[PDB]
Design a protein around this ligand. Structure first.
Ligand SMILES: O=C(O)c1ccc2cccc(O)c2n1
Ligand SMILES: O=C(O)c1ccc2cccc(O)c2n1
Ligand SMILES: O=C(O)c1ccc2cccc(O)c2n1
Ligand SMILES: O=C(O)c1ccc2cccc(O)c2n1
Ligand SMILES: [Zn+2]
Ligand SMILES: [Zn+2]
Ligand SMILES: [Zn+2]
Ligand SMILES: [Zn+2]
Ligand SMILES: [Zn+2]
Ligand SMILES: [Zn+2]
Ligand SMILES: [Zn+2]
Ligand SMILES: [Zn+2]
Lengths: 320, 320, 320, 320
């Protein structure tokens, strides 16, 4: 099923408590959503599906090019599919900068608040506010008002703190301001972006622990691993140790999805093309023929991600 | 928007009255649904989107393979998208034989009846019952009970009468039995499948007209043109003359969709593949890169279909 | 074997006498020479192999780029191969304009004159002088001195008369000047270029016949059909009627040669490329694997040419 | 130029004396011969071109399939080309087992003996007798009679001693029998095959040195490195130390030759194929278009080979 806000919070809490993480797979279509969920299920894992601003726009079609429409349409598709699987699937929106809040995250929040007001659950279970391009205080000011709105709609907020230089530098004062402005979850759960290539996360936890009068080994922050494509399956290990509960994946699953399509076109070149006055071969230019292969291949890469992140076999539905 | 049952009936009535038809495009995904709707809109046309049993199964993903799930999920996606366009889009299910009624058309009907009972509109606006493999009397017996259920859920029924030998032969008695069992629309609108390669349709109308005590030039039947891929844009003309209001399209739009994907893989062979120890090129193995081209190309072929069928420029929203 | 000057003259005389023609296949390599000869042999036909200035330069290799070297090297290769076949193969050089006579046709002539002076036969059996870019009188002046040199080395000269506008226009006076300057073969055999798209050849023969005091149906000229790629196998018929004894072929055999190579690369994409850290498949990146297919395919197209030109089955060796 | 027997012996002596080696490039065509020679020349190096039994058969064309014809035809081509370069090119035949001596090496030897008897030089400068499949004594018996014939035609003999298990094991007694039967060059120079993956060569030299009453560091054998594709450019170093004067290369140059052809077909897919009723693009299905790229790429790999083997910059023509 789709993760209810309650099981989503439980997923993240359990991951944090046991030093594992969920892959958060960028999806852009019915096929990629299907590959991602099947991958979670094959790994006996819960998981996260996320739509970027570009993915949402793509999802809405060339005739619309509206992020909200694309995200809503893909979310509604995903709700139907996920109900048929015995793992929990959370829906998320990726990087939304200041100039796109009004045309992406805010209208999506409003849709979920409307649903919650009628006794429903939100359409998405988390949204990312990416304020990295603005000064920290403005970043956290926006974050605070978004966090209140999100919490009230039963939605977790992801944020990104510090400066982008690609890698994300975050100072000890940035970590402190974040705890100060947002608290430690008691005003609504939130996730904090981070990159690697690592002890910065460790320092972030210690800084926050000190601020909160907590033992020096406490991990107040739930971290989100960005930019980890093909990363050292040892950096991943270390990332997990410092409280990463979510690792974003796109590049790796894109290659996995496209790879068999490429192979299909080459081996079936004279079926997918009308060559030398011939009429091609319907069975191989049928989009389902290569897109099933794309799906299965992406699902396999998602299974690998669940194993690398150690969430495989740990779905909260305990379907074993 | 999605066609309400009322505007769908109006669409078909207008087409019949003015000797034009709508293409009914097989779709299997978010991308293909997007291409189809954009095509209707670019042609200023209303249109029909249909899911085959195989397309629905594909739509549900390899991890589910459930026709109802796939059709529902794609329908929900399509409802969101279609609301953003100023043309009317009807949703349809294609060929459902006897052995699949219980796992496709019947559960879908029940979903729509539930929606209608709550004062809503049906999820789909038409369903096809393909009884061509059974004797005509059994075919029409099933058709009658399905027609009653469909009409009560504000859904139009498509049926296929006669024997498949590919082409569809339908005798004058088959046409007569059909009018006798089903009436002429007063017990619920229905569509009748037909093939070409043509005067058979003409004879069908005359036979039905005689039965109904109507003038010899009346056209009681609304016909559905099956198997018309790449057909003589002159057979199409003649088809229109005999009351075809819906022409099914799949092969042509499949080739249009796949063609640029093929071209993308070839020209970007060393970007979509990691070659000679290189790491490929993310920008071209990003599925959106070639799938946007696929979408645009399918939309173009759909525009052509609207022009060939003369529904281009005639959307009932009169957005000109 | 290679055509001796005597059998080459006999070949052309027989073709002219019986209204058939030989294809003259542009070749650029050992593989293309092999495909051409095998094609002649499979059709039980004599034939002509010709090297363009560009083909000769290509034949000499990127490190040399010398037309004479390339033509000589390919000719020597061809002498060895042709001795193993029971058909006669003539060697020819294609289009040589004024500015290239000193670096192509003239040095080649000198090589053959040297061989003849030692009691041998010439290396090539014909050479083309293409003077179409200069005024007719200069064209024929050069032609006359070249014809004397060629005849003395037992070589037939091909020339091109008239203006290029692509198609070749040749006036009745041009035909007359040609007979006047060169005679009708008694001062050395020569071939006259022509194009189609046809009665111009007919007029040329009548004009020459009148000049020579011959019956109105005589055909003094041996014509060479240039620019006939994919031509109407009815234009070919008419061409034959007017004294075409040689039809130049390049485009058609290029496509035939390349076509299976293309197919080989696509179907073996992950063998001819090292993909995803794999090492490729030696058996399919072995140049012989696809080049054998290229050869066989070009030979087939050459067989077709022999049949279209009616020289198939008529080799002067009468190996049946 | 082509290496005269005298400069070929000088090449090998110099290489041995200075611990370098020549690549011996398998070639199968005019294009591959051109790429190899251009590669030697670009590296300022002498080099060896060799024809395998399969390469020779391929060279003769599908219509002939005769090893002698193919080798002779390619050799004659190569004589013309090599005269235009300021490096020395030796011609060689690769692996000829017992059952093919009568249809490959022996007739080729006879051709060269005929040339030498008329005061000419041999057509080939070395031939390989591969007796590895027969018992050592039979191997060396054949080798002795072949060596006498070769020496008398001014040809160097390559032999292969020991058992194939792929790698070549050669015992100390095998090395001793070889020196005993053949001497150390005073009865005609010969080359001895060897593989790596290395001290076996060292032991071979010591064994031969002992037999000949030579200092323990003498290197009586001229070794030929077989099976060294992509080998450790450190094994190559060690190979050189033990008296390897010739390293056979095929796989590496095959991949280099084919690689750009593959790329050409993919990027020009709709030019090399007639697609969607189009007629293709002559400029890219012209075999010269991709074969020039193949040639240049193979030449580059040959330059690399000359550098790895340290013969680059050491051509005996001292054209600097
Ligand atoms: O793919 C990403 O989301 C990604 C990639 C690189 C990054 C560098 C710094 C901060 C981020 O959020 C980054 N994010
Ligand atoms: O594509 C089709 O739906 C199709 C194709 C061929 C047919 C022949 C007879 C009856 C049909 O419904 C047919 N339908
Ligand atoms: O391929 C050719 O040789 C060719 C092609 C087109 C021509 C047009 C006029 C005259 C020629 O020799 C021509 N030749
Ligand atoms: O490519 C070759 O010539 C080759 C390859 C592998 C071998 C193994 C043992 C002996 C040889 O001559 C070998 N030769
Ligand atoms: Zn990021
Ligand atoms: Zn459990
Ligand atoms: Zn049908
Ligand atoms: Zn209007
Ligand atoms: Zn021409
Ligand atoms: Zn005969
Ligand atoms: Zn070997
Ligand atoms: Zn020097």
């Amino acid at each position: 099923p789709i993760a209810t806000p309650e099981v989503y919070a439980e997923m993240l809490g359990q991951a944090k408590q046991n030093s594992y993480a969920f892959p958060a797979i960028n999806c852009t279509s019915s096929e990629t959503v299907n590959a991602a969920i099947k991958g979670f299920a094959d790994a006996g894992s819960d998981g996260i599906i996320q739509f970027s601003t570009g993915g949402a726009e793509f999802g809405s079609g060339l005739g619309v090019k509206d992020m909200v429409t694309g995200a809503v349409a893909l979310a509604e598709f995903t709700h139907v599919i996920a109900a048929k699987y015995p793992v929990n699937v959370a829906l998320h929106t990726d990087h939304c900068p200041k100039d796109k809040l009004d045309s992406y995250v805010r209208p999506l929040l409003a849709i979920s608040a409307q649903r919650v007001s009628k006794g429903g659950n939100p359409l998405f279970q988390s949204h990312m506010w990416d304020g990295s391009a603005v000064p920290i205080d403005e970043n956290l000011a926006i974050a605070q008002e978004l966090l209140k709105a999100a919490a009230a709609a039963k939605i977790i907020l992801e944020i990104e703190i510090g400066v982008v230089g690609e890698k994300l530098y975050t100072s000890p004062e940035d970590f402190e301001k974040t705890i100060e402005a947002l608290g430690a979850g008691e005003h609504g759960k939130y996730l904090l972006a981070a990159t690697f290539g690592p002890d910065i996360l460790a320092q972030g936890q210690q800084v926050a622990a000190a601020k909160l009068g907590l033992p020096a080994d406490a991990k107040p922050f739930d971290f989100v691993f960005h930019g980890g494509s093909g990363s050292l399956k040892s950096e991943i290990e270390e990332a997990l140790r410092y409280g990463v509960v979510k690792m974003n994946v796109d590049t790796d699953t894109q290659y996995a999805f496209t790879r068999p399509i490429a192979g299909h076109m080459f081996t079936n070149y004279d079926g997918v093309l009308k060559v030398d006055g011939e009429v091609g071969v319907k069975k191989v230019y049928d989009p389902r023929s290569y897109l099933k292969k794309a799906e299965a291949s992406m699902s396999q890469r998602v299974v690998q991600a669940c194993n690398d992140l150690h969430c495989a076999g740990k779905s909260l539905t305990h379907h074993h």
